[PDB]
């Protein structure tokens, strides 16, 4: 029940829509939150060091 | 200002004095037409101020 690891799901669930009309890719909020989680873990490591 | 389709339809509705007994049905295709199967009417009108 206590979660200490996170299963990131396959790229099938998370779309990456490269908007050809612009220089960008529409991305799921889940991928952004995964990026934020990785950043948080790394900055926690940095602050511990 | 009259659209081309309406103009063509109105031109089609116009009767002709040609005797139909002297001609034959145009065959399938042959859109050029021959002497027997078709006639031609050329209409050119230009509107200018007096």
């Amino acid at each position: 029940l206590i979660l200490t690891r996170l299963l990131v799901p396959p790229l099938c669930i998370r779309p990456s829509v490269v908007s050809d009309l612009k220089s960008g890719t529409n991305e799921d909020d889940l991928t952004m939150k995964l990026t934020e989680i990785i950043f948080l873990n790394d900055v926690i490591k940095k602050h511990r060091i | 200002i009259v659209q081309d389709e309406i103009l063509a339809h109105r031109l089609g509705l116009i009767p002709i004095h040609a005797d139909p007994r002297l001609f034959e049905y145009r065959n399938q295709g042959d859109e050029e037409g021959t002497e027997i199967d078709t006639l031609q009417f050329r209409l050119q009108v230009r509107c200018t101020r007096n």
């Binding site: - | 081309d4 389709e5 063509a8 339809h9 031109l11 089609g12």
Partner: protein, 46 residues
């Protein structure tokens, strides 16, 4: 090649090159149409 057009309300025969600001000679209009095609077009009486 002369690429020609027609203006908004005086119908002046305005050949303009590309990138030119849209102006009517003998006027100052800035709305402008294209002339009709020269190619033959077949219509059906139906």
């Amino acid at each position: 090649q002369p690429m020609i057009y027609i203006c908004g309300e005086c119908h002046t025969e305005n050949e303009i090159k590309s990138r030119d600001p849209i102006r009517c000679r003998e006027c100052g209009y800035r709305i402008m149409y294209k002339k009709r095609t020269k190619r033959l077009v077949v219509f059906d009486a139906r």
